[PDB]
Amino acid sequence: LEYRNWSKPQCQITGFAPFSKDNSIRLSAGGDIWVTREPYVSCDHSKCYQFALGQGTTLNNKHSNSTIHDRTSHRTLLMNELGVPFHLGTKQVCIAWSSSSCHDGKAWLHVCVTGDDRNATASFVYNGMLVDSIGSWSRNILRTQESECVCINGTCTVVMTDGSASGRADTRILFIREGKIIHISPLSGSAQHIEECSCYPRYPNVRCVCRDNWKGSNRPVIDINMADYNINSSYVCSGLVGDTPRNDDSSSSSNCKDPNNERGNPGVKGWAFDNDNDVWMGRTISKDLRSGYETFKVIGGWTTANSKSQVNRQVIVDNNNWSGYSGIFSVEGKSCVNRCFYVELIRGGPQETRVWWTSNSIVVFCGTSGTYGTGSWPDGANINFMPI
Amino acid sequence: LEYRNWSKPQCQITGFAPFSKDNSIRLSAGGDIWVTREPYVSCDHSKCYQFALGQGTTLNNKHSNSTIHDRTSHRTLLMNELGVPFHLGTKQVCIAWSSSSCHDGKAWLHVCVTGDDRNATASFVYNGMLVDSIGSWSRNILRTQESECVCINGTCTVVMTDGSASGRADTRILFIREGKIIHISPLSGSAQHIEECSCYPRYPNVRCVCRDNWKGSNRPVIDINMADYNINSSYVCSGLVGDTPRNDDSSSSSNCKDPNNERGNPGVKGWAFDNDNDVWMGRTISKDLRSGYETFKVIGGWTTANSKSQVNRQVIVDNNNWSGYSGIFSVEGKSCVNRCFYVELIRGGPQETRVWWTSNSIVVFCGTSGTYGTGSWPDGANINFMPI
Amino acid sequence: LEYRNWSKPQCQITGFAPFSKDNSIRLSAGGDIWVTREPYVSCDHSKCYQFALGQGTTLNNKHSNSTIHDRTSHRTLLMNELGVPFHLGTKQVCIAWSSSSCHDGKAWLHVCVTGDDRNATASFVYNGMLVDSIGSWSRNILRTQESECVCINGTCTVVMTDGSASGRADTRILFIREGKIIHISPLSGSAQHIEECSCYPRYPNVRCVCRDNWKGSNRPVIDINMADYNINSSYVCSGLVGDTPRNDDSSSSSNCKDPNNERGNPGVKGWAFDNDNDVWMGRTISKDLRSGYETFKVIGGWTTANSKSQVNRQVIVDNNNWSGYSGIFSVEGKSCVNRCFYVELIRGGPQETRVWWTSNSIVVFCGTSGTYGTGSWPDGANINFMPI
Amino acid sequence: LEYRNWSKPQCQITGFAPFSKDNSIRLSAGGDIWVTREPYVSCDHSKCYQFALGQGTTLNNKHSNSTIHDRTSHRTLLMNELGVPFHLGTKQVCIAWSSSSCHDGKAWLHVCVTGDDRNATASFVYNGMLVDSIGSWSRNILRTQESECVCINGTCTVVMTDGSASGRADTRILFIREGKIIHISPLSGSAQHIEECSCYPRYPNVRCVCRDNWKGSNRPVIDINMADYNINSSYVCSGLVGDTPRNDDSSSSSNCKDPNNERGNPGVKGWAFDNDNDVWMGRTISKDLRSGYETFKVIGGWTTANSKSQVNRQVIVDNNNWSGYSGIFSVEGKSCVNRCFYVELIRGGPQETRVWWTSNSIVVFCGTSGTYGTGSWPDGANINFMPI
Ligand SMILES: *[C@@H]1O[C@H](CO)[C@@H](O[C@@H]2O[C@H](CO)[C@@H](O[C@@H]3O[C@H](CO[C@H]4O[C@H](CO)[C@@H](O)[C@H](O)[C@@H]4O)[C@@H](O)[C@H](O[C@H]4O[C@H](CO)[C@@H](O)[C@H](O)[C@@H]4O[C@H]4O[C@H](CO)[C@@H](O)[C@H](O)[C@@H]4O)[C@@H]3O)[C@H](O)[C@H]2NC(C)=O)[C@H](O)[C@H]1NC(C)=O
Ligand SMILES: *[C@@H]1O[C@H](CO)[C@@H](O[C@@H]2O[C@H](CO)[C@@H](O[C@@H]3O[C@H](CO[C@H]4O[C@H](CO)[C@@H](O)[C@H](O)[C@@H]4O)[C@@H](O)[C@H](O[C@H]4O[C@H](CO)[C@@H](O)[C@H](O)[C@@H]4O[C@H]4O[C@H](CO)[C@@H](O)[C@H](O)[C@@H]4O)[C@@H]3O)[C@H](O)[C@H]2NC(C)=O)[C@H](O)[C@H]1NC(C)=O
Ligand SMILES: *[C@@H]1O[C@H](CO)[C@@H](O[C@@H]2O[C@H](CO)[C@@H](O[C@@H]3O[C@H](CO[C@H]4O[C@H](CO)[C@@H](O)[C@H](O)[C@@H]4O)[C@@H](O)[C@H](O[C@H]4O[C@H](CO)[C@@H](O)[C@H](O)[C@@H]4O[C@H]4O[C@H](CO)[C@@H](O)[C@H](O)[C@@H]4O)[C@@H]3O)[C@H](O)[C@H]2NC(C)=O)[C@H](O)[C@H]1NC(C)=O
Ligand SMILES: *[C@@H]1O[C@H](CO)[C@@H](O[C@@H]2O[C@H](CO)[C@@H](O[C@@H]3O[C@H](CO[C@H]4O[C@H](CO)[C@@H](O)[C@H](O)[C@@H]4O)[C@@H](O)[C@H](O[C@H]4O[C@H](CO)[C@@H](O)[C@H](O)[C@@H]4O[C@H]4O[C@H](CO)[C@@H](O)[C@H](O)[C@@H]4O)[C@@H]3O)[C@H](O)[C@H]2NC(C)=O)[C@H](O)[C@H]1NC(C)=O
Ligand SMILES: *[C@@H]1O[C@H](CO)[C@@H](O[C@@H]2O[C@H](CO)[C@@H](O)[C@H](O)[C@H]2NC(C)=O)[C@H](O)[C@H]1NC(C)=O
Ligand SMILES: *[C@@H]1O[C@H](CO)[C@@H](O[C@@H]2O[C@H](CO)[C@@H](O)[C@H](O)[C@H]2NC(C)=O)[C@H](O)[C@H]1NC(C)=O
Ligand SMILES: *[C@@H]1O[C@H](CO)[C@@H](O[C@@H]2O[C@H](CO)[C@@H](O)[C@H](O)[C@H]2NC(C)=O)[C@H](O)[C@H]1NC(C)=O
Ligand SMILES: *[C@@H]1O[C@H](CO)[C@@H](O[C@@H]2O[C@H](CO)[C@@H](O)[C@H](O)[C@H]2NC(C)=O)[C@H](O)[C@H]1NC(C)=O
Ligand SMILES: *[C@@H]1O[C@H](CO)[C@@H](O)[C@H](O)[C@H]1NC(C)=O
Ligand SMILES: *[C@@H]1O[C@H](CO)[C@@H](O)[C@H](O)[C@H]1NC(C)=O
Ligand SMILES: *[C@@H]1O[C@H](CO)[C@@H](O)[C@H](O)[C@H]1NC(C)=O
Ligand SMILES: *[C@@H]1O[C@H](CO)[C@@H](O)[C@H](O)[C@H]1NC(C)=O
Ligand SMILES: [Ca+2]
Ligand SMILES: [Ca+2]
Ligand SMILES: [Ca+2]
Ligand SMILES: [Ca+2]
């Protein structure tokens, strides 16, 4: 077995093609299925897995009530092959109310954060063993990506934050080999607030697009130099911004450098990635709520501030249906590294109060250099058919 | 690992022997089992899998209602080892309301079609990665085999149609290596309408027997030359025709060349295969409805128009029980390539209106050169014992 | 991978030690568990599997009613790792209302009989492929061991019967290589009626102890010469006889040669094996009903007619609890071939009429050359706690 | 494959980090989950498994009643990957109302004890085969560790007791190679009563910390010399004692040598391990009941009698929540052997009489040389949401 280097060029993409869907909520009305949120996808070579933070209960179960307390000690990181819904045979890989996982080519790394808000612990589990742990540096919800980390030549990087969700916080970028923390770099550069980073390999380095929960409806970007541990940061240039909430398209802005001070707080986990001067990005359709999901390319959107010329739009979820978090993962093909993304389809609270629980299903799409059509792939459950 | 070539002669067959049965509907009355239709079987060397298009729900689940809308965004391709019913641990391999899968000797290819009727996407998933995609060329339900594709020396072929279900359409034959489309040949020859092809290796080439939904109750045949991408087509010679609906045996015909204009529309997915001048074929027992299932050999049925001398008949399902789609798969033994087939046993709508759902079980038989007796292997559920 | 030869001496045994128990019926009152009967155990090297004939339904399911019609087309052979109860993820390996399985060192052989009573088919499935089939030779319930077959150097032998259950029938011994029947020897010697053989390797040959359903409460024995296909047969010498029904111990007999004409019909599947002049054997405790289960050694019981001096008795199931079929399997250890046995614990019909179904759990014991104590390991379900 | 030697130094530990949690009881309110008690953890290299003694039933099942009869013939040893709750697909590895398991680097050893209290049998299952068995030597509940055994260079050791739970008994230490007992050493030294040992590798030997159920609330220690089979024994020096019941911290004692005669009977399974002159240990928070769980290091606690200076305390379960048994397991990392522990979280009888059953969930922590914070990780079920 060999370490992944991801040393191929990024695939050409013309858009995205449907890849996977788990139908979790529909199934939960006639089967024992885990209550989850904050899902993601990561792959051991070409074999892809779905992950989520469990609420320590199934859906048709009185313990499903009030999974709006985001951090309890019952929460565990679930891991199944992609497309296998979270049934009762699902492995709980670690104790976690925040996580990130990734495979280095030889084994799985899981970063799992649990415990008290003011004094949390992160456990680093590598090839099934507990190798390292760190306590909270700012005593205010030590927390991480909720999507895949990335490893290059045996070194894995993960972004973590500790401190305020609505003011300056303390973000650090960890470098980890075989589960062991070998270096920690504080955040540097012009990003002013970092949450829930969606990271990808850009060989020899890593790049992340995150969520600013303080002043920005434009998404921050982090560049992680794997050879010297140097961090820089800025904001995606596109004037079509990726966060929710945000201004409408005619009055949204980004200068590439600073938070835009437009509906800055709070936010939603999301992603984008560069292709030369252009950016491919997803976002909720609604500017206000986590409703709908669309992807498009912004011409000049990576290098020209305030660019708003989109092309290759695709609806992933129509705006009559609920979305949620979204994130990037990468898959190395024969000749190029592809980019894929998942969308969390949140059902139940706070937007659907008939039920008392909150859970999600997923839909997943991957980059394509071929052709495609149109559609919409929402959760599909009828809230009136659900146990409450 | 090496590519399959299937370069052995076809096995001698005297008829078929019982191979597999999943009892899906019986179990659905006391267990959480997927609602499915359009099943098939395909094997990774000798290890055989059952596939179907899920309806995004289990049977005992209010979401089971009205799975007569054949194409929704909840539909996913399920894949289990043959004989493992579609329980909640079943992997949803792709998003699909039409599919075909096959193993090239090194990995699995899935062809998955989803999205809007007028602008569908097909995704090509190979070894678990999205490698290619194509959009609809005629904007009218891009669709494929609902049974296994076939690969020879690393090149896989699949038949797809886009356009009218009851008039001339646009059928193309794709050639795919490691998930990538390398060539596309339009249909050519005298077949006038193609649906739901049942294809098999006939080394060095592939042969398919399909469904004509327009003018033919005789089944069209497609020959796919793997070395030069040349396509020819015609109709099975046998005067005992394989489609449903059809004329009764005394007044059914086929000239080997054209649709017979006997009860031409619609049809049912089915199969047949050649042995020298004779044809082995299945069909529903009823000429009108998808009831019963029988197999037999027609002497001269491959090369002599209107031949009606059958022999070696076997009842698979008696005519008091529901059948459905059927298809071919091939299995390479020590010395010869065998032919096998599955029958979809459809329960619920439209023929059984007590329930509101529609789902299926399967029975599976393989060619034998030994001896055998008689029986009937229907679904076996009692519709009055089912949740509605 | 290499063929099993089983070419080590039989282990010394002082009795048997507890090995496995599945608790199937207890679990069926709070879980979806298959209705089964006729279980057995066979091992791929040291990895052991449990097998049974399913009734095409779970227990808490209205289709569980009247599983006293022993042969229907819903019956399939289930196969799980030993100790894994028959949950909804269980693989249905073939269509079968009678079976035998065995592993040749390279792959699994399953012999599966289904279809009409008067014209049944047996399918021979090897490494997951249908390799051969035979039809009924006497048109009266072609049927087989319901326990493991045995393979030596790539040749597997299985005993089958076709004809009367209460008069002379036609028993044949099949020799099968890679799923293909290569020879068939009619039964020969003094056994007069053969059912449900429990067979084991006695290198270079195989030996079986069966059930006589016609005139014998003594068990018949079959010796199968693997080098020349020669069959001989006789009866276990022990005057403590192994069938049920039988005379009480003071008035039971066997002359080693003929059926004893004591309560000859019907019978129960069982086992015994030789150790020099002595026999180790199990049997129901009750002489009349399938209640209780005991093992013991009979001194001179292999070679001296009417020997009744037992020693090393063990209760497996006390006589207040239901038993059922029992059978032998063998496991090769470091230095010797061990003998093990399972007992079917039948619950529900005809002895427990509160429920309408009939199903079983299992208990399993293996030979030991160490020491042991006492106990009783019955099914343990409370019939009043079961769905009906 | 090679035998484990565990020949690396013990890892530095600063405390423990969260590792695993199964949420068994919460899930049992909305899913079919095994009723268990006496869980433990053991790992095949870095791949960790959870084990427990099943009660032959799921929780939502009328058979769940009165699982306070600790030893019945329905009890089996369950084995799943760590973090996979005991769902209906769980394998029952042996028949057991007391057990110990361990992996020698090549295969799994299970020590399983079942049968009558006065004449029990222990079965020794290695690589899936029954290799040996021993009967009861004192005819009074032959019994063992309820946590992992330990193997060095192919020889596995396990501690067993037979005789009184409240007076002198007969404890022996078995040495087993490939499932075969090769030596048995009686207990020797100053420990006066041994139950439920928690053992770990201390290369080239093994060390155990057990439960004294007779006169001691200090925990006995056993040292097992693997080269010469020599046994010595004593008591953990710490004046902060590990058993429950016990005196409060101001009046608890231990002289390193004898039972302390402080609330000597009964006890709870627990663990401790040495680091030079200091001891790391867990215990219930309550001195009286199996409530809460804490870990800490006692300075001089290994070598100085009555030392009470603790440091590095961690709450694992707060004192408002139920605990239970706890035990040690060891995991070899790149450079050192780590120590981990599990806590059984018992719900239902006798402390929670609303329900009629008794079952448990688990939480699991591993040693760390990094940093960490605080929290509490109790079972988390609401007893009023459970079926009774
Ligand atoms: C079957 O399926 C295919 C594949 O999904 C689908 O084709 C895709 O259609 C969409 C929608 O038309 C295309 O995406 C749009 O692209 C245009 C720009 O492309 C054109 O113009 C530039 C010149 O600048 C050329 O280079 C280029 O080659 C094209 O001529 C964007 O302008 C679109 O964005 C606007 O419209 C969206 C709604 O469609 C809005 O959501 C978005 O916010 C934008 O609107 C805003 O800007 C407008 C001014 O531009 C303004 O008028 C609005 O009010 C608002 O302020 C969008 O990105 C996509 O590229 C097609 N993909 C491919 C590969 O061809 C087919 O349409 C479909 N078939 C059928 C029958 O429907
Ligand atoms: C135990 O199980 C075995 C194996 O399943 C079973 O044997 C099989 O029996 C069937 C039924 O008889 C056989 O299949 C039939 O074969 C005949 C042709 O074979 C004869 O004639 C030709 C001469 O041309 C010889 O070469 C040959 O050797 C035979 O002598 C077909 O004619 C049959 O088809 C007709 O009958 C079917 C009903 O059985 C109809 O469904 C079908 O539509 C055909 O009827 C039509 O054609 C007739 C004119 O031919 C006309 O009269 C009718 O009205 C109608 O228009 C069928 O293919 C099969 O080959 C046997 N298989 C083997 C391997 O031997 C046993 O019968 C069974 N045992 C018992 C006791 O039942
Ligand atoms: C803890 O657990 C152990 C292991 O399970 C257990 O030891 C086992 O006990 C049983 C029961 O005693 C033993 O099995 C019996 O063996 C005797 C023969 O052995 C003795 O005699 C011969 C001389 O011929 C010596 O060679 C030998 O070494 C012994 O001295 C059998 O006679 C027994 O069978 C009769 O009794 C059974 C009931 O126990 C009946 O079911 C059976 O039908 C037999 O009864 C019939 O025959 C009798 C005449 O023999 C007649 O009187 C009756 O009415 C009837 O017609 C049985 O096979 C076994 O060997 C022991 N195993 C070992 C390894 O030692 C301990 O007993 C147990 N501890 C406690 C406290 O109970
Ligand atoms: C975020 O999370 C971290 C990591 O969990 C946590 O830090 C940990 O705090 C605990 C609690 O303070 C520490 O454990 C205690 O250690 C002291 C000893 O350490 C001091 O003293 C010695 C000098 O001997 C120095 O070597 C050392 O460096 C320290 O200065 C123990 O005394 C503690 O035990 C007592 O208190 C416990 C309650 O906390 C009682 O349960 C226990 O029974 C002991 O009390 C008894 O003894 C007392 C006499 O000593 C007596 O007064 C009492 O009445 C009673 O009889 C305990 O072991 C631990 O080491 C810290 N860990 C690390 C790695 O730093 C943070 O506190 C947390 N953050 C926040 C904001 O809370
Ligand atoms: C679950 O959670 C909430 C909080 O406990 C419950 O909502 C309360 O229900 C009670 C009793 O019906 C009311 O008196 C309160 O006014 C409700 N509180 C709130 C904040 O709305 C809810 O009832 C529970 N749901 C279920 C299904 O058990
Ligand atoms: C499933 O779907 C169909 C369509 O929604 C429902 O059938 C209707 O039921 C209503 C209310 O009982 C009737 O008034 C309509 O006449 C029915 N429509 C048709 C087209 O027959 C059906 O009721 C739903 N079934 C279940 C079990 O919910
Ligand atoms: C299942 O099987 C048997 C046969 O159908 C049923 O027994 C009959 O029940 C009916 C209606 O209650 C009675 O009138 C008959 O006298 C019964 N027949 C016999 C042969 O006893 C039984 O009721 C069915 N059981 C269930 C639970 O559905
Ligand atoms: C579970 O087991 C116990 C013992 O059988 C049962 O407790 C008894 O219940 C009966 C009937 O309600 C009472 O009259 C007795 O006084 C109870 N006995 C004791 C010792 O308390 C209990 O009822 C059974 N529980 C269930 C749910 O069936
Ligand atoms: C990968 O890391 C190794 C080990 O430190 C180093 O020697 C090697 O140069 C690296 N490979 C690349 C492609 O940078
Ligand atoms: C299989 O394809 C390879 C690679 O292109 C080719 O060189 C070879 O000739 C082919 N084999 C056969 C049997 O046609
Ligand atoms: C096993 O069978 C082979 C192949 O036919 C034969 O040559 C060989 O002698 C046999 N081995 C034994 C031990 O009989
Ligand atoms: C392990 O056991 C082997 C086989 O008996 C022995 O020869 C060898 O010396 C042992 N290794 C160690 C490290 O003691
Ligand atoms: Ca924001
Ligand atoms: Ca037609
Ligand atoms: Ca008999
Ligand atoms: Ca004590």
One-letter-per-residue 3-state SS of D24-58:
HHHHHCCCCEEEEEEEEEEEECCEEEEEEEEEEEE
Q: B208, B200, B201: which is closest to B172 by C-alpha?
A: B208
User: Distance between CA C215 and CA C193 in Å, rounded?
Assistant: 8
Return the half-sphere exposure (C-beta side, CA atoms, 13 A cut-off) of residue C114. Answer: 29
- Structure-block tokens of residue D33: 């989950």
CATH number at residue A87: 2.120.10.10
Which residue is listed with tokens 């006889």?
A: C241
Catalytic residue among D70, D132, D170, D258: D70
Phi-psi category of residue C203: left, alpha or beta, with phi > 0 → left and psi -120 to 50 → alpha: beta
> Can you list the positions of beta strands (E) in D243-336?
272-275, 278-283, 291-299, 309-322, 326-332
Question: Nearest chain D Cα to C22, which residue?
Answer: D92
Domain region containing B115: 1-388
Q: Environment class of residue B359 by beta-carbon count within 10 Å: exposed (0-12), middle (13-18) or buried (19+)?
A: buried
Distances (CA, A) of A52 to A41, A229, A361, D4, D184: 9, 29, 10, 35, 49
Residues 6+ apart with CB under 8 A from A6: A150, A152, A201, A203, A330, A332, A337
User: Distance between CA D249 and CA D239 in Å, rounded?
Assistant: 8
Q: B215, B208, B172: which is closest to B193 by C-alpha?
A: B215
Task: List alpha helices for chain D, DSSP H.
Answer: 24-28
Residues 6+ apart with CB under 8 A from C381: C25, C26, C28, C29, C347, C361, D63
Under an 8 A CB cutoff, do B57 and A81 touch?
A: no
Residue type, B22: D
Give the phi and the psi of residue A186 in degrees, each rounded to 5.
Answer: -65, 155
Q: Chains touching chain A at 3 or more Cβ pairs under 8 angstroms? A: B, D
Residue type, D85: P
D133 contact C CB<8A: yes
- Structure-block tokens of residue D189: 């030294």
- Structure-block tokens of residue A2: 């060999």
3-class state of residue C176 by DSSP: strand
Q: Residue D286 Cα, ligand 16 centroid: separation in angstroms?
A: 14
- Structure-block tokens of residue B6: 């299937």
Phi-psi category of residue D340: left, alpha or beta, with phi > 0 → left and psi -120 to 50 → alpha: beta
Using only C-alpha atoms, chain C has a radius of gyration, in whole angstroms, of 19
User: Distance between CA D6 and CA D117 in Å, rounded?
Assistant: 36
Return the half-sphere exposure (C-beta side, CA atoms, 13 A cut-off) of residue A213. Answer: 16
Q: Environment class of residue D229 by beta-carbon count within 10 Å: exposed (0-12), middle (13-18) or buried (19+)?
A: middle
User: Distance between CA D35 and CA D56 in Å, rounded?
Assistant: 7
Using only C-alpha atoms, chain D has a radius of gyration, in whole angstroms, of 19
Q: A343, A366, A341: which is closest to B123 by C-alpha?
A: A366
Distances (CA, A) of C96 to B301, C123, C143: 33, 9, 10
Give the phi and the psi of residue C370 in degrees, each rounded to 5.
Answer: -95, -145
Domains held by chain D: number: 1
Residues 6+ apart with CB under 8 A from A111: A99, A100, A101, A122, A123, A124, A144, A145, A149, A158, A160, A174, A176
> Can you list the positions of beta strands (E) in B104-154?
108-116, 119-126, 129-135, 150-152
DSSP B251: T
**Vertex B42, ends B40 and B48: CA angle to 5°?**
110
> Rounded to a whole number, what is the distance in angstroms from the first to the last CA of chain C?
48
User: Distance between CA A243 and CA C137 in Å, rounded?
Assistant: 75
Distances (CA, A) of C307 to B366, B374, C263, C304, C310: 51, 47, 19, 6, 9
Instruction: Identify whether D204 is preceded by a cis peptide bond (ω within 30 of 0).
Output: yes
Residues 6+ apart with CB under 8 A from C250: none
Sheet holding A272-275, edge to edge: A272-275, A278-283, A291-299, A309-322
DSSP B250: T
Q: What is the largest CA-CA distance in chain B?
A: 55
- Give the nearest partner residue to A84 out of B89, B123, B132, using CB atoms: B89
User: Distance between CA D144 and CA A92 in Å, rounded?
Assistant: 29
Q: How far does Cα C121 stand from its chain's mean position?
A: 21
- Structure-block tokens of residue B195: 């649906």
User: Distance between CA B177 and CA B183 in Å, rounded?
Assistant: 10
A138 contact D CB<8A: no
Select the residue from B123, B132, B140 to test the A interface by mutation, using most A Cβ atoms within 10 A. B123
Q: Percentages helix, strand, coil for chain C, rounded to the nearest 5?
A: 5, 50, 50
Write a three-state SS string for chain A: CCCCCCCCCECCCCEEEEEEECCHHHHHCCCCEEEEEEEEEEEECCEEEEEEEEEEEECCCHHHCCCCCCCCCCCEEEEEECCCCCECCCEEEEECCEEEEEECCCCEEEEEEEEECCEEEEEEEECCEEEEEEECCCCCCCECCCCCCEEECCEEEEEEEEECCCCCEEEEEEEEECCEEEEEEECCCCCCCCEEEEEEEECCEEEEEEECCCCCCCCEEEEECCCCCCEEEEECCCCCCCCCCCCCCCCCCCCCCCCCCCCCCCCCCCCEEEECCEEEEEECCCCCCCEEEEEEEEECCCCCCCCCEEEEEEEEEEEEEECCCEEEEEEECCCCEEEEEEEEEEEECCCCCCCCCEEEEEEEEEEECCCCCCCCCCCCCCHHHCCC
Cβ(A294)–Cβ(A316) below 8 Å? yes
User: Distance between CA A76 and CA A66 in Å, rounded?
Assistant: 16
Which residue is listed with tokens 């013990």?
A: D10
- Structure-block tokens of residue A214: 């303080």
3-class state of residue C24 by DSSP: helix
Residue type, C351: Q
Q: Environment class of residue B353 by beta-carbon count within 10 Å: exposed (0-12), middle (13-18) or buried (19+)?
A: exposed
- Structure-block tokens of residue D365: 């922590």
- Structure-block tokens of residue D346: 């018992």
Chain B CB contacts of C181 under 8 Å are 370
Cβ(D230)–Cβ(D205) below 8 Å? no
Smallest CA–CA separation between C145 and chain B, in Å? 19
Please give the torsion angle defined by the CA atoms of residues A157, A161, A162 and A164, in that order, rounded to the nearest 10 degrees: 170
Return the half-sphere exposure (C-beta side, CA atoms, 13 A cut-off) of residue A90. Answer: 35
User: Distance between CA D173 and CA D160 in Å, rounded?
Assistant: 6
Q: D101, D107, D81: which is closest to D1 by C-alpha?
A: D107
Parallel, antiparallel, or unpaired: how do β-strands D180-186 and D195-202 relate?
Answer: unpaired
Residues 6+ apart with CB under 8 A from B228: none
| Secondary element (H or E) of residue B282 | strand B278-283
Helix count and strand count (H, E) for chain B:
1, 24
3-class state of residue C279 by DSSP: strand
User: Distance between CA A275 and CA B242 in Å, rounded?
Assistant: 53
Distances (CA, A) of C369 to A326, B94, C11, D160, D388: 62, 54, 8, 20, 45
Determination technique used:
X-ray
Distances (CA, A) of C237 to C43, C215, D201: 30, 16, 54
Instruction: Identify whether D220 is preceded by a cis peptide bond (ω within 30 of 0).
Output: no
> Rounded to a whole number, what is the distance in angstroms from the first to the last CA of chain A?
48
Please report, in range form, the residues annotated as the binding site of B for substrate: 37, 71, 195-196, 211, 290
B369 contact A CB<8A: no
User: Distance between CA A41 and CA A43 in Å, rounded?
Assistant: 7
Phi-psi category of residue C285: left, alpha or beta, with phi > 0 → left and psi -120 to 50 → alpha: alpha
CB atoms under 10 Å from CB of A106, counted, come to 15
Under an 8 A CB cutoff, do A30 and B56 touch?
A: no
Q: What is the largest CA-CA distance in chain D?
A: 55
Task: List alpha helices for C196-312, DSSP H.
Answer: none
Cβ(C302)–Cβ(C284) below 8 Å? no
Give the phi and the psi of residue D64 in degrees, each rounded to 5.
Answer: -70, -15
Helix count and strand count (H, E) for chain D:
1, 24
Q: Is the CB of A388 under 6 A from ligand 5?
A: yes
CB atoms under 10 Å from CB of C153, counted, come to 17
User: Distance between CA A386 and CA B8 in Å, rounded?
Assistant: 54
User: Distance between CA C108 and CA C91 in Å, rounded?
Assistant: 14
Cβ(A61)–Cβ(D24) below 8 Å? no
Cβ(A180)–Cβ(A157) below 8 Å? no
- Structure-block tokens of residue C147: 């326990």
Q: A234, A242, A229: which is closest to A295 by C-alpha?
A: A242
Give the phi and the psi of residue A317 in degrees, each rounded to 5.
Answer: -130, 130
Cβ(C198)–Cβ(C243) below 8 Å? no
D327-340 per-residue burial string, b: 16 or more CB within 10 A, e: under 16? bbbbbbbeebbbbb
Residues 6+ apart with CB under 8 A from A153: A3, A4, A5, A226
Q: Which residues pair with A265 in a beta bridge?
A: none
- Give the nearest partner residue to B81 out of C91, C121, C131, using CB atoms: C91
Please give the torsion angle defined by the CA atoms of residues D137, D141, D147 and D149, in that order, rounded to the nearest 10 degrees: 10
CB atoms under 10 Å from CB of A388, counted, come to 12
Chain A CB contacts of D48 under 8 Å are 128
Give the phi and the psi of residue D238 in degrees, each rounded to 5.
Answer: -50, 130
Residues constituting chain D: 388
Task: List alpha helices for chain B, DSSP H.
Answer: 24-28
Chain C CB contacts of D36 under 8 Å are none
Cβ(D91)–Cβ(D73) below 8 Å? no
Smallest CA–CA separation between D227 and chain C, in Å? 24
Distances (CA, A) of B81 to B33, C40, C343: 15, 22, 29
> How does DSSP assign D244-261, residue by residue?
SS---TTT----SSS---
Instruction: Identify whether C201 is preceded by a cis peptide bond (ω within 30 of 0).
Output: no
Cβ(C351)–Cβ(C13) below 8 Å? no
- Structure-block tokens of residue D82: 């760590």
A212 marked among binding-site residues: yes
> Rounded to a whole number, what is the distance in angstroms from the first to the last CA of chain B?
48
Helix count and strand count (H, E) for chain C:
1, 24
Cβ(A42)–Cβ(A103) below 8 Å? yes
Distances (CA, A) of D238 to D194, D217, D264, D307: 18, 11, 16, 5
Cβ(C14)–Cβ(C312) below 8 Å? yes
Cβ(D280)–Cβ(D297) below 8 Å? yes
- Give the nearest partner residue to C333 out of D60, D131, D181, using CB atoms: D131
Give the phi and the psi of residue D383 in degrees, each rounded to 5.
Answer: -55, -25
Cβ(D120)–Cβ(C17) below 8 Å? no
Catalytic residues of B, by residue number, are 70, 325
Smallest CA–CA separation between D32 and chain C, in Å? 6
User: Distance between CA C241 and CA C239 in Å, rounded?
Assistant: 6
Give the phi and the psi of residue D176 in degrees, each rounded to 5.
Answer: -135, 130
User: Distance between CA A37 and CA A34 in Å, rounded?
Assistant: 10
